[PDB]
Symmetry: D2
Subunit: 124 residues, 4 copies
Amino acid sequence: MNSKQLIQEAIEARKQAYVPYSKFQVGAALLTQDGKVYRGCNVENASYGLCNCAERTALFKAVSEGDKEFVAIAIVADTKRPVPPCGACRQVMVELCKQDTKVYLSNLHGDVQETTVGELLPGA
Amino acid sequence: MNSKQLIQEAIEARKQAYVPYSKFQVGAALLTQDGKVYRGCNVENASYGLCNCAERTALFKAVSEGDKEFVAIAIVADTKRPVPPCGACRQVMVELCKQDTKVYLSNLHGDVQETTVGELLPGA
Amino acid sequence: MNSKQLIQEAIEARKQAYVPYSKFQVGAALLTQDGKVYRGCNVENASYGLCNCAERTALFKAVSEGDKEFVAIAIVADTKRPVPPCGACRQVMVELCKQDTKVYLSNLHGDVQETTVGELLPGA
Amino acid sequence: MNSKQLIQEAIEARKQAYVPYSKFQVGAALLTQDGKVYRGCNVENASYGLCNCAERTALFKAVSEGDKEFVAIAIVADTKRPVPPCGACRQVMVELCKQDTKVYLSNLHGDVQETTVGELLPGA
Ligand SMILES: [Zn+2]
Ligand SMILES: [Zn+2]
Ligand SMILES: [Zn+2]
Ligand SMILES: [Zn+2]
């Protein structure tokens, strides 16, 4: 599937977000080499340090089903420009994905920035 | 179901753990009010602080799929006595579950302790 | 020094808190067996999962100076009743302190609950 | 000062690390606009996810003492080439420091890479 369809999956994933403290909904969608998609959203805690990001939710759900080979991930939020993952998600993406895996950052108004896991974290 | 079946499901969940640094696999299985089961495992990182626990992987999976009403959780590891979740897991369960929700801590050699989300975190 | 003086140290520590997202200031003060006090406050991030608690700040600062034997800690916030540490701070306190180390939870209106590190985290 | 002196201070900071699980000591030293130095080290937990990095321990110490204006940081570990901070550390530095603040990554065998907070986290 193409980047436009994986972005839609992230738009759908995002609607499921648990965010009463920030009210800021993020969604992600991870695609395996076999073509399966894993959806993820952010999940907050009143104790802010325990908040979990969409990207990590999607990745942990894929690992938990025994899927380990990932080709791309799309990430979506209602920002002005597409905003990239926070530094802690980038680090997890580096652990679980290859340097060349595609990352499509997007917002709800059609903006798109394609990058890679490696480029997101210089020297990781 | 029953508690012995949710423990079996956690036993199976533990097999998917990603643990190359600690080598220590954990599994959890979460039961919804409707009787849906969600499995999780711990997922580690070379940066230790970014490691994620079994209980969280199950809970965040359920949230991401739209389930928010949980009746019980089982947690399993190769320990001597059954061990309770770490304090950060306890804090997540308090946010996402009711104080009366049932927690079965088990090992691979028979031992079972049953407790509750509330009893695990006094004053939370 | 007594619990009333360690609580004052926490009241002073709290004024230094970095919290633009929650605007909720916490302070702590850790006392060594030799009588030295370490002050700590919470420090937030726009990426909420990276927020750090007062208790952890105080503890990490004590370790970083080579102090390892702790007799008590006081914790203060502007809550109705004294509120206990979040589950992740409890876990760190367990790693670095003895089960019998004293914890004074307090607010700005004189309320005080004394407990212990061990009692804060059943079975840790 | 100079970069070689801040590196020496990180070399000293690393000696206080609490690392019984990874065994891997890291040090950091942070320099304020006024020329005050704050040292930190990594502090580990049996629950890997609760581990804290050197860079954070230094930064949170400075904040807790009222210093918020940072001109440079040095970070030191026993690696083959100098290694950059993990993504979660990068995200903290972005919040607490200016994009132009100077970062010296060093090892114990001569190697030095100088970079910046901004260069370490593109698009942050
Ligand atoms: Zn993130
Ligand atoms: Zn845990
Ligand atoms: Zn806390
Ligand atoms: Zn780090």
